[PDB]
């Protein structure tokens, strides 16, 4: 290819590859994969893409875009790197730069979505107007495609329509302006919007480049934080203050929208699994909700500072 579009500010690479075929009258879905990569077996993925580097060689004559900038600033990889572990973070890039695809989701053992859960194509009613007025084009954005919360962090709730990534595995689709974007009455859960606003700044923050606290470090930090202001009895978990904080700040309908039911009656609950010694990777939702419940006046980056320092 001779004219590969430069990615806009804060967009996914999937929409960039789509606009790389919208701009030159290529309508057969096979030819786009034939020209961009050269293989007819390459897949289409939203968040954590692979085969990167071939997408950077096209932009090579521009000295700015490289592999590291593409992966950190233009994917959904920032959400998984700091929390899981340092060595896995450092090896994910070398596993992802090359042609391997199956190992990417396996090694980062959190992407067991099974059936495509909310992988329907999503957009926002108000953001598209701003993108139109300031650019003249519409595209997919990383703010919309948060893995769990189906809410735009600034405002409102995303507009689901009926299609899926598994409907066509070998097709890159760009957003169509002539495809009608119809508004619906906004049904918003304010707690979910607040959580989205709280978790948004981590996506574009330089300090998340290398800071990943260790497993034992996580355990000591959580024990010390629980004992700082009295969330732990003498060698026993209180089980009451932890529940009443999260029920004060979060209601039950928010938790069922997040599919994160608490189980005080049942012994196996994720809240108790967090406070016990960690052995597997944990999602950002649990850490975020614990941070919000335990102390409400601290930012995500400085929370990671305090977690990692001690």
């Amino acid at each position: 290819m001779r004219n590969f579009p430069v990615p806009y500010s804060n967009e996914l690479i999937y929409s960039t590859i789509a606009r790389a075929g919208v701009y030159q009258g290529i309508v057969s879905p096979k030819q786009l994969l034939d020209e961009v990569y050269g293989n007819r077996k390459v897949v289409a993925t939203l968040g954590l893409p692979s085969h990167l580097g071939v997408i950077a060689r096209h932009l090579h004559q521009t000295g700015r875009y490289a592999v590291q900038q593409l992966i950190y600033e233009h994917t959904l990889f920032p959400l998984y790197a700091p929390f899981v572990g340092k060595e896995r973070r450092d090896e994910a890039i070398r596993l992802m730069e090359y042609q391997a695809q199956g190992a990417v989701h396996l090694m980062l053992g959190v992407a067991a979505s099974r059936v495509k859960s909310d992988n329907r194509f999503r957009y926002c009613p108000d953001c598209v107007a701003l993108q139109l007025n300031r650019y003249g084009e519409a595209f997919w954005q990383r703010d919309w495609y948060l893995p769990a919360l189906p809410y735009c962090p600034k405002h409102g709730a995303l507009v689901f329509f009926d299609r899926a990534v598994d409907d066509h595995r070998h097709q890159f689709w760009a957003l169509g302006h002539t495809e009608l974007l119809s508004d619906y009455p906004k049904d918003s859960l304010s707690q979910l919007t607040a959580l989205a606003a709280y978790i948004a700044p981590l996506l574009d923050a330089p300090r998340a480049q290398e800071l990943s606290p260790s497993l034992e470090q996580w355990t000591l930090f959580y024990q010390r934080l629980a004992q700082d202001l009295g969330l732990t009895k003498s060698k026993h978990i209180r089980h009451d203050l932890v529940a009443e904080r999260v029920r004060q700040t979060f209601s039950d309908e928010a938790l069922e929208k997040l599919d994160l039911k608490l189980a005080e009656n049942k012994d196996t609950c994720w809240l108790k699994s967090i406070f016990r010694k960690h052995r597997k990777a944990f999602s950002y939702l649990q850490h975020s909700i614990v941070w919000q419940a335990l102390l409400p006046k601290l930012t995500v980056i400085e929370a990671l500072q305090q977690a990692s320092a001690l």
Binding site: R2, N3, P5, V22, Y23, Q24, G25, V27
Partner: protein
């Protein structure tokens, strides 16, 4: 294929204040310096006059390829081409979000197969058109290879990634078949850029309707400046329904798509245009401009005359030789140079090292016989007699 990095100017006109495309070109020049810039000649030097005969013969024969002189009209043509190639980028600005609309609409025409489909009514296109009709042998192609050689062809930007192509030139197929013009547009952007658009767009058997939209969208994939079409007379020789099809597609492209187009052809191709744009007519030069002999003829004859390579020659020119030239050639720009070169070649070969009128007459009547019948009509001057044949003034 001259890849050049772009460094911008600062234009004065407020309409061009933002574009990178129109601020990447070399500046337009005043008519005073433009006439001097175009002119080129030979190095000559007196050291060759006493060299061998064979070494002199090739230097004599190298006259017609390296000798250009600007006439009166070329200074108008350069200005008009500059204006018409600068006026086609104000509606495709990438900074203020205009190329994205002009390029997004072109996908819809590809999908449905109609060229009148539009998605954004705000997209406005500005373009111009011209035709350059002149008698054969008047040197109109070389004018469009020397005026349009100041602008470099492929310029590469770095803020964007667009590889702008400033000008492109195609030749219509001899049969005029409606598929080969589209198949030859992907064979000039194929060599001037070093790619393989032909394989991905031509081998896959598509209809003409979709192949016409593929052209109009690929031309806007880059920033095409000028699509000049040479040898337009072959369009009349196609099958039925094609004579008007690409006299409507080439005005659809100018009006809707927004790529400027200029057509160049012979006088016998004017009929299809008039079977139903600014018009510039080119005519062979004549000495008898109003009541006194023209200065251009004398100046050009002296400039060509000072390139002789004969050991014993007449430095000053005589008017009888000028009259012989004007009565044997009739002023068409091809005959004069070839006639002079042949005359001095025969003079060098014979042994008589000086050019005379008799030698000119003998060479003209012995070596240019396939050309005489048409020149008889030009020499006679009768309108009815000159009206026959083709490629003559009408």
């Amino acid at each position: 294929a001259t890849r050049i990095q772009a460094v911008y100017r600062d234009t004065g006109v407020e309409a061009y204040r933002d574009n990178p495309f129109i601020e990447a070109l070399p500046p337009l020049q005043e008519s005073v310096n433009s006439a001097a810039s175009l002119k080129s000649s030979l190095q000559l030097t007196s050291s060759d006059l006493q060299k061998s005969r064979v070494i002199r013969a090739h230097t004599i024969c190298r006259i017609p390829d390296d000798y250009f002189q600007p006439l009166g009209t070329h200074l108008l043509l350069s200005e008009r081409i500059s204006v018409m190639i600068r006026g086609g980028y104000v509606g495709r600005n990438p900074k203020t979000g205009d190329l994205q609309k002009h390029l997004q609409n072109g996908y819809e025409r590809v999908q449905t197969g109609e060229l009148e489909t539009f998605r954004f009514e705000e997209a406005r296109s500005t373009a111009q058109s011209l035709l350059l009709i002149g008698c054969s042998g008047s040197g109109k192609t070389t004018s469009l290879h020397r005026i349009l050689a100041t602008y470099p062809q492929v310029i590469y930007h770095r803020e964007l990634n667009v590889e702008q192509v400033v000008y492109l030139k195609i030749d219509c197929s001899h049969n005029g078949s409606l598929k080969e013009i589209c198949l030859n547009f992907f064979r000039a952007l194929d060599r001037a850029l070093g790619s393989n658009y032909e394989r991905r767009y031509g081998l896959k058997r598509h209809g003409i309707e979709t192949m016409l939209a593929l052209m109009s969208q690929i031309a806007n994939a880059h920033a095409l400046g000028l699509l000049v079409i040479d040898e337009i007379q072959h369009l009349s020789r196609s099958r039925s329904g094609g004579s008007q099809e690409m006299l409507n597609f080439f005005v659809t492209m100018v009006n809707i798509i927004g790529v400027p187009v200029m057509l160049i052809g012979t006088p016998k191709a004017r009929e299809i245009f008039e079977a139903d744009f600014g018009a510039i007519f080119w005519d062979p030069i004549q000495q008898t401009q109003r009541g006194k002999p023209n200065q251009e003829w004398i100046a050009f004859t002296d400039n060509l005359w000072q390139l002789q390579l004969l050991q014993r020659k007449d430095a000053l020119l005589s008017d009888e030789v000028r009259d012989v030239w004007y009565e044997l050639s009739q002023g068409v720009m091809d005959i004069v140079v070839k006639l002079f070169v042949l005359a001095q070649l025969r003079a060098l070969a014979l042994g008589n090292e000086r050019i005379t009128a008799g030698l000119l007459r003998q060479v003209y009547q012995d070596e240019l016989k396939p050309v005489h019948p048409m020149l008889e009509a030009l020499r006679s001057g009768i309108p009815e007699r000159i009206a026959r044949y083709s490629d003559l003034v009408v």
